[PDB]
Amino acid sequence: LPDSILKRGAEASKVLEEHLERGNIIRIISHNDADGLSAAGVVARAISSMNGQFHISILSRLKKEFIKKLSGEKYSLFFFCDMGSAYLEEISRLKGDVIVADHHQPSESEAGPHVVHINPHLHGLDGSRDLSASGTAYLATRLLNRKTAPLALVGALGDMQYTDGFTGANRFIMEEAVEEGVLQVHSDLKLASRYTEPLYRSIAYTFNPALPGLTGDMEASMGFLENIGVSYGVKYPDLSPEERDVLRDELTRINPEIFGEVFTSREFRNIGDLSDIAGVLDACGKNRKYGIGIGLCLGEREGALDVALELQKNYREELVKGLAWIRREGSTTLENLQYIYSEDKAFKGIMGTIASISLSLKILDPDIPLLGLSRMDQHVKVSARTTRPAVERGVNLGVALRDAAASFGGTGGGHDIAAGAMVPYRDMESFLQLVDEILGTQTGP
DNA sequence: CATGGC
DNA sequence: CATGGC
Ligand SMILES: [Mn+2]
Ligand SMILES: [Mn+2]
C-alpha cells in the first residue's frame, strides 16, 4: 500500500496512544453493518490491548443533529468508523481531536486541522475494491495492536470486496496477518457455516457462490448427497479425504467458483471462517442487536453467540422463501428488462439480495437486467441488478435509475452492475417503461 | 416533540 | 448501489 496511507494511519495512531496515556475514554461512532461493526471492534480491541476505556454508538446513518449532540459530550477523542467523509465540515466544527476512518465518496471540501481523515480514495486506492472501513481502522491502529487483522478482513467480506482475490490493502492486511500468525489462508470448499451446520443445510445456505439446484433447497441437496455416496447429516470437517474428494469433484461441476480461498483465525474456530463471521455480524446489525455484534468482536461467546447464530439462521430462512417465491411467480419480461414485484413486507429489506442470487442460480435470465420492486404504500423501492456480461455490453443501472427516478420527482442511483431508486407508486408503470427505453439507448445503436 | 431504521 | 427522504 502507498506510503502516504501508512503515514496517515501512523498520524492517527499517535493521536490515540497519547490520549490513552492521559487516561481519556474514547468515543467510537460506527455503522450498523458487518464493516461498521467490525471497524468498531478493531478500535475497541486496540483500546483494550492498552487498558483504555471507550463508548461505542452504532448508527445506520450519520445525521447533523447527532454531530451537534456530540459536541457537548466532553470527550477528548472522537473515532468515526465507516462514516464521516460526507459531513467533514460539521465534524471539523466539533471540539477536541477527531479521526475519520471512512471509505465513502469524500468531500472535496476536505476540512479539519484537528481532524485526521483516513480514506483510501485520498491515496489513489479504490474505495469499493481495495480497502474497507474496518481495514482503514486497522491502518489507524496497526502500531498498537496487530492481533485485530482478522476483524479487518471480516468487514471487507461483508462489504463485498472479493473478486478472485482481495485487491490492495486488504491483500496487504491479509499478508500481514498471516506473517503475524493470526490468520490462515487455505483453498477449500466455500460452504456456509461448516463448523456449525450439517452438510445438507450448509450446501442449502451457500447463497454465494450460488449452487444451481442446491442453493436454497434442503430436499435437493439432501438428495444430491445421498445419491453421491455422502452422509447428508455429517458436518464438513468430519468427512474423510476420499469423501471430501468426492463432494469437491461434484460441487466443482455445479459451479467451479465454490473451490477457493477460505480464511480462519483461531479466535473464530468453533464459529466460522471470516465469511461466516461477516454473515453473523450482518444479521446482528439488521436486528439492531449491536451489543451482541460488538460482543462477538471482543470475544463474548456464551448465549450471545447462540442468539447471533439464530439471527443468521432466521435471515437465511427468509432468503430461501425468498428464492422459493421467485420461482413460483417468475419475472414478467420486456424489451431490455425483467422486473418482479411484491407488496409483502417480508421481502422489502431482502429484495436486492434475492434479486441477484436468482440471477446467479440462473432462475431468471442473467443477460436481461432485473428490477426488484417493493411497495412502500405511495412509493416503490427499486433494487436493480444484472450480470458482468450485461455491463460489458452497454448496461449501466447507476445513471439510468437516477435519470428516470428524478423524472418523477423520485430519487435513484448507484453503479453500474447494481442500482437503487425510490419512486412514486402512481408512476411505477411509466417509470418501468422509461428505464426500459433508457437501457435500449444504452445497448442497441 | 425526539430518534433511528432503510 | 446515491443518498437523505419516508
Ligand atoms: Mn463499509
Ligand atoms: Mn457500511
Side-chain angles (χ1 to χ4, degrees), chain A residues 12 44 100 127 324 340 371 378 426:
Chain A
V100 172
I340 58 191
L371 262 56
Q378 300 193 201
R426 60 183 150 77

Side-chain angles (χ1 to χ4, degrees), chain A residues 35 82 103-104 133 159:
Chain A
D35 196 32
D82 202 10
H103 73 127
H104 287 234
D159 222 342

Side-chain angles (χ1 to χ4, degrees), chain A residues 337 351-352 355-356 359 369-373 381-386 395-398 400-401 413 415-421 431 435 439:
Chain A
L337 252 205
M351 185 61 72
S356 53
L359 303 172
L370 172 56
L371 262 56
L373 305 155
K381 205 201 167 293
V382 185
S383 307
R385 299 291 188 275
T386 194
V395 171
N396 178 326
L397 306 172
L401 255 65
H415 332 311
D416 172 14
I417 197 167
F431 167 82
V435 166
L439 291 183

Side-chain angles (χ1 to χ4, degrees), chain A residues 26-31 36 39-40 43 55 57 59 61-62 66 70-71 77-85 88 90-91 94 97-103 114-119 133-134 136-137 140:
Chain A
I26 318 300
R27 190 73 149 78
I28 300 161
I29 312 79
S30 209
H31 199 251
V43 195
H55 181 57
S57 306
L59 290 164
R61 189 194 131 202
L62 196 75
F66 183 89
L70 226 47
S71 23
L77 189 43
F78 299 95
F79 204 136
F80 292 89
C81 291
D82 202 10
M83 46 203 205
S85 315
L88 279 159
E90 298 75 313
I91 297 160
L94 231 64
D97 279 357
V98 177
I99 303 185
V100 172
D102 196 3
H103 73 127
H114 61 296
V115 179
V116 186
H117 212 155
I118 324 190
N119 177 331
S134 63
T136 301

